[PDB]
Design a binder for this molecule. Structure first.
Ligand SMILES: *[C@@H]1O[C@H](CO)[C@@H](O[C@@H]2O[C@H](CO)[C@@H](O)[C@H](O)[C@H]2NC(C)=O)[C@H](O)[C@H]1NC(C)=O
Ligand SMILES: *[C@@H]1O[C@H](CO)[C@@H](O[C@@H]2O[C@H](CO)[C@@H](O)[C@H](O)[C@H]2NC(C)=O)[C@H](O)[C@H]1NC(C)=O
Ligand SMILES: *[C@@H]1O[C@H](CO)[C@@H](O[C@@H]2O[C@H](CO)[C@@H](O)[C@H](O)[C@H]2NC(C)=O)[C@H](O)[C@H]1NC(C)=O
Ligand SMILES: *[C@@H]1O[C@H](CO)[C@@H](O[C@@H]2O[C@H](CO)[C@@H](O)[C@H](O)[C@H]2NC(C)=O)[C@H](O)[C@H]1NC(C)=O
Ligand SMILES: *[C@@H]1O[C@H](CO)[C@@H](O[C@@H]2O[C@H](CO)[C@@H](O)[C@H](O)[C@H]2NC(C)=O)[C@H](O)[C@H]1NC(C)=O
Ligand SMILES: *[C@@H]1O[C@H](CO)[C@@H](O[C@@H]2O[C@H](CO)[C@@H](O)[C@H](O)[C@H]2NC(C)=O)[C@H](O)[C@H]1NC(C)=O
Ligand SMILES: *[C@@H]1O[C@H](CO)[C@@H](O)[C@H](O)[C@H]1NC(C)=O
Ligand SMILES: *[C@@H]1O[C@H](CO)[C@@H](O)[C@H](O)[C@H]1NC(C)=O
Ligand SMILES: *[C@@H]1O[C@H](CO)[C@@H](O)[C@H](O)[C@H]1NC(C)=O
Ligand SMILES: *[C@@H]1O[C@H](CO)[C@@H](O)[C@H](O)[C@H]1NC(C)=O
Ligand SMILES: *[C@@H]1O[C@H](CO)[C@@H](O)[C@H](O)[C@H]1NC(C)=O
Ligand SMILES: *[C@@H]1O[C@H](CO)[C@@H](O)[C@H](O)[C@H]1NC(C)=O
Ligand SMILES: *[C@@H]1O[C@H](CO)[C@@H](O)[C@H](O)[C@H]1NC(C)=O
Ligand SMILES: *[C@@H]1O[C@H](CO)[C@@H](O)[C@H](O)[C@H]1NC(C)=O
Ligand SMILES: *[C@@H]1O[C@H](CO)[C@@H](O)[C@H](O)[C@H]1NC(C)=O
Lengths: 5, 524, 524, 524, 5, 5
C-alpha cells in the first residue's frame, strides 16, 4: 504494498 | 486590288519572311519559303511555350552569405526542472509523514498554496486509498503537475514555485553585473511552474564575461529529505512524460521579443555542470505569395509578439483540440479568441463528498476526467500528421526571421580542490547567498541552506549548482535571402531574343501588320 | 552575271551589313562597311564563345527553402555499449575465480555460449600464461570483442548478448505505449553484439510523449562484481579502440529503411542521464550525370535497402581490403557478391594442441593472426585518403536524400528526492521490471536485480538507467534542391539576343543566304 | 537637298521605324508612326534602366553541393582547464599551510616559478591582510590567473604549468600510435597556461582508431589536497569569468595552419567522460570586391598563418583597446606592429615597501591597477557593438575558407566493473603511466600518483581521466561557392534581346545612322 | 572571517 | 605481476 501519501 | 496592297506591304515591310513569299515568282520557291516561315513560327511557339512555363512557375532564387550586420543578443529563458521550492516540498513531505490524511492537514498551514494543495489532494485521497491495485495508472496521471496548474490560481502557485532570488545566484552580461529585478521577467508555464526570461541591457559593477551572458543557478535537489519508504507526493511527477523526473535547468534561446515554448524547444543542463552555448546567428528573408509563402503576423494571435511558426502551429493544434474534445489542452497556449473554454484537466465539478467517501460517483467522475485527458492526448498525437487540417490554419514561415544555431558543451563546474574552494567562497563568502533567505518569510529555508551548504561538505553540496555560459561564437550573421529568379524584365529580354532569333519581328513590326490589316479592312 | 545576282541579293536581303557593301559606290565606303561587318562578326564570335563555354560547363542551380511537406519519423537504433548480459559476465568472472584454467571449465556450464567461449579461450590460455611479459600487446588484441564475434556463431552469441526484454524498460511513441515485440528489430554488429532498431508505428495504452519517441534503457554496469585484483576477461575490451571501454547507449538516427553503421555514426548517452534529441529534418535533391553526379542504388549491394553514400564507401573499403590482405575486415559489411572470404580474425585453423602446450607453432600462428589484423588495419587507414582508388568505386551521393540535424542535450534523469522516488516506483512498482526476469531461464538475474535495485539504495542503483527523448524540433523541412542553371531554352534566348545585337541575322535570314549560294552554284 | 538624303536613308536603312515616318504620305500616318516609334523608344529606355540597375548592383550567385574532394585533417588544440601542475599546487598549498606569510617562503624553494610566484604574492600580501572587508572584489581580481601570466616570464611559467608528458596518457591517429614529441606543439595562452596543438602525421605501432584521432587525457584534480578551511591560493581562480573554476579539457578544432583562440572557440569535455567529435567538413569560396568582400591575408598580422576572420576581429579589438586605455589587453593577441605596449595588468612598478607595510601609496597603486583593468574590460564589452569602429578595421571573411561542424556526445569512459579493470590495466599496466614521473625531477609527483592511482580505489581515481574521440563523420565536403550572377556576357545578351524586341536596332545599324549624320554634316 | 593565504 | 584470467 500500500503506497501512502 | 489585293495584289496592289500585297506588293506595297512586301516592299515596305520589316518582316523577314513574307517579303519572299509575296514576291515569289516560282511555285516551288513560294512553297519553300512558306514552309520555312511556318517551321520558324512553330519552333518559336514551342520555345515561347517553354519560356512562359518557366515564368509562370514563379521560381525562387536563394543566396547564402555572411554579413557583418549584427543581430541583437537573444533572449534567454531558464526554467528549473523542479517546479516547487525546496522548503515547500520538505514541509509537504513532513506534513504527510506526521499525518497521511490530507483532509486533516488543510488548516495546519497558513501558506495559501499549501491549503489549496491539500484541499485538492483531499478531493482525491479516499479514491487513492481504495483503487491503487485496480487503477494504478489513473492516479499517477491525476496527480501530475498539469492537474494542479490547471486548477490552482497561478498567482497562488507563484508563491510556492521557484523564486528568482532563490534561483539565480549571480549573473553577468557585457562585462557588467545583471540587475535581477529589471532584467529578468517571470512567466508561468503549466509544467515548469516558474520560468524567467532574461532581456539584454547594454551598458550605460564592471565584472564578468565581456562577450556574452553568464549565470550561476541553483538547480539540484540534494537538500530534499530522503525518505526510507516510497511515498506519493502529488504535483511533483508528470507521469511517463519525456521530462518526467529530470534534474537540471531547461534553457531556451530565442529572439528577444518572442514567447518561449520550453517543452518543445531549448536545451538541458544537468546540475554540477557548466554549459557553454556558442551561438551562431542566422537570418532568413522570404518572398511573398506569388513566389513563396510567408507571413508577418500570427493569424490566431495579436500583434504584441514577434511572429514564429511554432506559435502558429501550436495555436492551430489548440484550435483543433478545442473543436474535437470540447476543452483546451493545458500544454498549449490558450487562443486569444475565446477564454471561456475550460482546461481538459479542470476538476472543480468534483463534489465535496469525495473527501469523505469513495463513492462510485466520484470514481465515475475520475474516469470521465481520465477519458478527457485521453481525448486531448489522442488529438495531440495525430493532428500534426494530418496535412489537410494543418494546411487549413495558414501557418507560413516568417518573412524575416532570426535564428540561432547553438554549440553545446559541458564542463564540471565546481572543480575538486582549491578552485572549488574559491568558487564556494565566491558564492557564499562574497555574494552571501544564504543571507538572501535569512529574511522572516524564509527563515526555514535559511536553516536548511546553512546546514546543507556548510564548509565541511562543500564538495558534495556544490554539485547542486549549475552554470550557463551563453556567448556569440561568430559575429558575422549567415544570411539566407530569397528573391525572384525570373523577373518580368528577364522575361521580356528572353522573349525579345527568341523573337529576333526565329522570326525577326519587333513590336513596331506588329504596327506594320496592323497597318496592313487596316488597309485590307478598308479595301474590303 | 555575278553582279546581277549580287544586286538581287542586295535588294531582297534581310541582312543589315552586306547591302551596304554590295551597293557601295565608293571604295572608302566599301572598306568602311566591310570593316564594320568584320568587326561585328568577330565580336559576335567572341561573345558566342563565352556563351557556349558557359553552357557546356553545365552549371547547377541550388535553392534552400523550408517546406511544410512532412518526412516520416526516422528509425532509431540503440546499441548498449556493454556487449554481454550482466548475469553471463558475472558467471564467467566467478567461474574464472574458482578455476582460472578455461580448459577445465568447458563442461561446467550448459549454456552454449559459455562452452564456445571457454573453448576459444582455452585455445589461447597456455600462450597467455607464458608470453605476457614479451608480447603484452598481442594478447590484448587477440582477446578483443571482434575476435569472438568473427569466430562464434552469431546465433550463439545472441543467447548471451543484451536481450531486448532486459534492455528497454519502457517505450512511448505518439502518445501510445510501444509494442516491444513488433516495433523493435534485432540486428547483429561485430562490436555491439546485440542492437535494436525501432521502426515507427502510427496510432490506429494512451500515454507518453505525443510529439516524439521516449524510452528508458538499462545501460549501467554497477551490478557487476568488483574484483579485488585486476583480472583479464576476454571478449570484453576492444584494445585501444576509440570506444574501448565506454559506458552508456549508442544512438543512431537514420532514415527508416536504411542500415545503421553504429561505429562511425550516431550519438552517445551516458548512464544516469536523460538525453534530448531535437531533430531538424532536411531533404536534398540532386541532378544526374550531365550537371552532377548522383545515384539511386548502391553499386555493390542489392535493392532491399535505401541508398546512402556511407554504405557504398564502406563496401568500397571492404572491396579494397579483400583484394590486398586476402581477407574481409569484420568491422565493415560483407560484400553481397562473394561470402566465401574469411574474416581477417578467423582462427579456426588453430590446432587443439594449443590447449595443452605453448609450442612455438602456436606462437607462430598467433603472430600470423596478429599480422593479418595489422594488414587489415593498415589498409583501413590509408585507402580513404587515396583518391584514385576511391573514385574507381563510383560512390555518388543519393539523388533524393533525407537527413537529420540533431540538437543534443543532457539532464540528470533520476532526480534526488521525491521525484526520484516516483521514477523508481514507476520502473519497479507499476511496470514491475524485475518480474520480467523471474522466469526460470533467468532466475539468477532475478536475484541480482532484486538485491541491486532495492528501495534502500535507489539513489545509487538508479544511476545505471538512462532515458532517451527523441522528437522533431521543427515540422518544416529544410529542402536543398539542385537544378540546371542554363537550360537549352535559355541558351537559345541568349544566342538570339547576341545575334540580333551584333549582326541582326535570323535563322530564315540564313535561308536567304542558302538561296544565294544555290543561285551561285546554279550560275557557276 | 535634305529630302534627297532623307529619301536615300529611308531606302537603304535597316531601322524598322523611321522608314515609315520618312516615306509617310499622310499627316495622320506620320503622326501615328512617330508616336509608335517614340513609345517604343521610351519603353526600351525603361527596360534598359531596369537592366542596368540589375547589372550594376553586382548580384552574387551561390551554390551548395557535396563534393568528394577531401580536406586535410583539422588541427586539434587541447587545453587543460587547470593551469598549473598538481604537484606544484600541492607544494604551494602546503607551504602556505606551514607559513602563511609569502615573504618568508621566497627562499624556501629552488623552483624558479615558486620563487617568482611568492615574490609577486608578497608584493600584495600586507594589503590583503588589511583590506579584505573593505575591498573584497579588488583582491579577487588581482589574484586572478591573468595577472601572473602578464607579469611572470612565460618560460618560467612553462616549468610549472601542465606538461605534455603528464597530460596526454596516450594518443592514436590513422591506426598508428602518435609521436608525442613530434606531433604535439606547445603554445602559451594567458588563461590556459600550457596548451598543445596536434598536427596530423599520415602513416609512412599499428594500433588505435583508423578513421580519426583518439587520446586519453588526465584532466581531473581529485589528487589535490582537501583543505579543512577555505584558503586563498592566488593564480588559480579567474574571478567571475565564464570559465572561472570549470574542470575538464577545452578542445578546439580548427584548420591545420591556424592559431587557436581557446577562450572564444572550442568545446568542453568533463573529466570521467568520453567525448565523440563527429566532424562534418565544409568549404566556403567567396568573390572579391565588385561582387562581395573577401581577403586572403590579415591586415594586422604577418603571412605566417592562414587567415581567419576571428584573428582580424580580435586584433581590431586590441588596436582599439590600446588607443583608448593606453595598454594592451592580455586576453587578446599582441598586434605584430609594436610590442612596447605594456599589458593592462602589468604591475612591475609596485615598490618593494609594499612587501612590509600596507601604506596608502600601495593601496592607491592597487586602485590604479584595478581602474586600468576596468578600462580594458569596458572597452572590450562595447567596441564590438560599435559598427563604425569595427568597419574601419577592414576585417572581411576569407576568400577560401575551410570550416568544421562538430557533432558532440558524451559517454562515461571508465565503465564500472571488468571493462574498467581492463582500462586501468591498459593505462597503468601496459603503458606504465606512473613510470613516466619516477624520474628524479618529478619524484614527488611519483609518490602522489602511486598513492592516488592504486588498484583498490581505481573506480574513483580513474574518474580524473577523460578521452577524446575525434573523427570525420562524412567524407564528402559541403561546398558553398559564390559566383557572379549577372556577367557582362549576360548583360550583352539581355541588351540585344531588349533592342531587338522594342526597336530592332543592331550595332551596325548604328553605323547607318553614323553615315546619315556624316552626310548631313557634309551637306550642311 | 579572516581569509588567509 | 602475473595477470590471470
Ligand atoms: C535595478 O533596477 C531597479 C528597477 O529599475 C532600480 O530601482 C530604481 O532605481 C532608480 C534609480 O536608480 C529609481 O529612480 C527608481 O525609483 C528605482 N525603482 C524602480 C524603477 O522601480 C535599481 O536601482 C537597480 N539597481 C539595483 C537593484 O541596485
Ligand atoms: C503557397 O501556399 C499554397 C496554399 O497552402 C500552396 O497551394 C497548395 O499546394 C498544395 C500542395 O501542392 C495543395 O495540396 C493545395 O491544394 C494548394 N492550395 C490551394 C489553395 O490550391 C502553394 O503551393 C504554396 N506555394 C509556395 C510557393 O509555397
Ligand atoms: C504486439 O505485437 C504482437 C505481434 O504483432 C501482437 O501479437 C499478435 O496479436 C494479434 C492480434 O492482436 C494476433 O492475431 C496475432 O496472432 C499475435 N501474434 C503474432 C502476430 O505473432 C500483440 O498482440 C501486440 N500487443 C501486445 C504484446 O500486447
Ligand atoms: C562526375 O563524376 C566524374 C567521374 O568521377 C567526374 O570526372 C572526374 O573528375 C576528376 C576531377 O576533375 C578527374 O580526376 C577524373 O579523371 C574525372 N573522371 C573522368 C572519367 O574523366 C566529374 O567531374 C563529376 N562531375 C560532377 C559535376 O560532379
Ligand atoms: C618521434 O619523433 C622524434 C623526433 O622526430 C624521433 O627522434 C628522431 O628520430 C630520427 C630517426 O628515427 C633520428 O634521426 C633523429 O635524430 C631523432 N631526433 C630528432 C629528430 O630530434 C623519434 O625517433 C620518434 N619516435 C619515438 C620517440 O620513438
Ligand atoms: C563591401 O565593403 C564595403 C566597405 O565596408 C561596403 O560599403 C559600406 O556599406 C555600409 C553599409 O551599406 C556603409 O555604411 C559604408 O559607408 C560603406 N562603405 C563605403 C566606403 O562606402 C560594401 O557595401 C560591401 N559590399 C559587399 C557586397 O559586401
Ligand atoms: C484531418 O482533419 C480533418 C479536420 O476537419 C478531419 O475531418 C479528417 O478526418 C482528418 N483526416 C485524417 C486522416 O485523420
Ligand atoms: C540573520 O538575521 C538576523 C537578524 O534578523 C541577524 O542577527 C543574523 O546575524 C543573521 N544571520 C547571520 C548573519 O548569520
Ligand atoms: C555539514 O553538513 C553535512 C550534511 O550536508 C553534515 O553531515 C555535517 O555534519 C555538517 N558539518 C558540520 C561541521 O556541521
Ligand atoms: C591507390 O590505390 C591503388 C589501387 O589500385 C594503388 O594501386 C595505388 O598505389 C594507391 N595509391 C597510393 C598513393 O597509395
Ligand atoms: C517469482 O515467480 C514465482 C513463481 O515461479 C512466484 O511465486 C514469486 O512470487 C515471484 N516473485 C515475486 C513476485 O517476488
Ligand atoms: C540494498 O542493496 C545494497 C547493495 O546495492 C545493500 O548494501 C543493502 O544492504 C540493501 N538493503 C537491504 C535493506 O537489503
Ligand atoms: C565608435 O568608435 C569610434 C572610434 O573612433 C568612437 O569615436 C565613437 O564614439 C564610437 N561610437 C559609439 C556609439 O560608442
Ligand atoms: C623508480 O626508479 C628507480 C630507479 O631510479 C627504480 O629502482 C624503481 O623500481 C622505480 N619504480 C618502480 C618501478 O616502482
Ligand atoms: C588506495 O588509495 C586510497 C586513496 O586514494 C587509500 O584510501 C587506500 O588506503 C589505498 N589502498 C591501499 C591498499 O593502499
Amino acid at each position: 504494498s500500500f503506497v501512502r501519501i | 486590288a489585293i495584289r496592289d496592297v500585297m506588293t506595297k506591304f512586301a516592299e515596305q515591310t520589316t518582316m523577314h519572311g513574307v517579303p519572299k513569299v509575296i514576291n515569289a515568282k516560282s511555285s516551288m520557291g513560294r512553297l519553300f519559303w512558306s514552309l520555312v516561315c511556318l517551321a520558324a513560327g512553330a519552333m518559336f511557339c514551342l520555345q515561347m511555350s517553354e519560356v512562359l512555363q518557366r515564368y509562370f512557375s514563379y521560381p525562387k532564387k536563394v543566396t547564402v552569405e555572411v554579413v557583418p550586420t549584427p543581430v541583437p543578443f537573444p533572449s534567454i529563458s531558464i526554467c528549473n526542472m523542479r517546479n516547487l521550492d525546496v522548503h515547500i516540498l520538505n514541509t509537504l513531505n513532513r506534513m504527510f509523514i506526521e499525518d497521511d490524511r490530507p483532509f486533516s492537514n488543510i488548516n495546519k498551514s497558513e501558506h495559501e498554496f499549501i491549503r489549496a494543495y491539500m484541499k485538492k489532494v483531499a478531493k482525491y485521497a479516499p479514491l487513492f486509498w481504495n483503487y491503487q491495485d485496480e487503477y494504478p495508472e489513473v492516479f499517477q496521471e491525476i496527480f501530475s503537475r498539469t492537474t494542479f496548474s490547471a486548477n490552482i490560481d497561478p498567482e497562488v502557485i507563484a508563491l510556492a514555485a521557484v523564486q528568482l532570488e532563490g534561483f539565480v545566484v549571480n549573473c553577468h552580461y557585457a562585462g557588467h553585473r545583471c540587475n535581477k529585478t529589471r532584467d529578468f521577467y517571470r512567466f508561468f508555464d503549466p509544467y515548469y511552474f516558474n520560468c524567467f526570461t532574461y532581456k539584454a541591457h547594454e551598458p550605460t559593477l564592471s565584472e564578468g564575461i565581456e562577450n556574452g551572458w553568464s549565470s550561476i543557478l541553483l538547480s539540484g535537489s540534494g537538500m530534499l529529505d530522503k525518505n526510507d519508504e516510497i511515498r506519493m507526493l502529488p504535483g511533483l511527477h508528470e507521469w511517463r512524460s519525456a521530462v518526467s523526473a529530470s534534474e537540471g535547468v531547461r534553457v531556451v534561446i530565442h529572439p528577444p521579443s518572442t514567447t518561449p515554448y520550453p517543452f518543445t524547444e531549448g536545451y538541458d543542463v544537468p546540475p554540477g555542470f557548466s554549459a557553454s552555448f556558442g551561438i551562431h546567428p542566422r537570418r532568413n528573408i522570404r518572398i511573398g505569395p506569388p513566389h513563396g509563402n510567408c507571413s508577418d503576423k500570427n493569424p490566431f494571435g495579436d500583434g504584441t509578439e514577434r511572429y514564429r511558426l511554432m506559435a502558429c502551429q501550436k495555436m492551430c493544434m489548440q484550435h483543433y483540440i478545442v473543436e474535437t474534445c470540447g476543452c483546451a489542452d493545458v500544454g498549449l497556449p490558450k487562443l486569444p479568441l475565446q477564454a471561456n473554454i475550460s482546461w481538459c484537466r479542470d476538476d472543480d465539478n468534483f463534489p465535496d463528498e469525495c473527501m469523505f467517501t469513495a463513492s462510485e460517483e466520484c470514481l465515475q467522475l475520475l474516469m470521465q476526467l481520465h477519458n478527457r485527458i485521453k481525448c486531448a492526448r489522442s488529438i495531440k498525437s495525430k493532428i500534426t500528421k494530418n496535412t489537410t487540417a494543418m494546411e487549413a490554419c495558414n501557418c507560413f514561415p516568417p518573412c524575416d526571421e532570426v535564428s540561432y544555431d547553438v554549440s553545446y558543451s559541458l564542463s564540471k563546474w565546481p572543480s575538486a580542490g582549491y578552485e572549488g574552494d574559491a568558487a564556494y567562497f565566491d558564492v557564499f563568502g562574497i555574494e552571501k547567498f544564504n543571507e538572501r533567505f535569512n529574511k522572516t518569510g524564509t527563515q526555514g529555508k535559511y536553516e536548511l541552506f546553512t546546514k546543507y551548504f556548510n564548509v565541511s561538505n562543500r564538495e558534495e553540496s556544490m554539485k547542486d549548482f549549475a552554470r550557463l555560459n551563453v556567448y556569440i561564437a561568430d559575429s558575422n550573421v549567415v544570411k539566407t535571402q530569397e528573391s525572384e529568379d525570373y523577373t518580368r524584365n528577364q522575361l521580356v529580354s528572353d522573349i525579345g531574343g527568341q523573337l529576333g532569333l526565329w522570326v525577326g519581328i519587333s513590336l513596331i513590326t506588329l504596327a506594320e501588320v496592323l497597318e496592313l490589316i487596316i488597309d485590307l479592312f478598308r479595301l474590303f
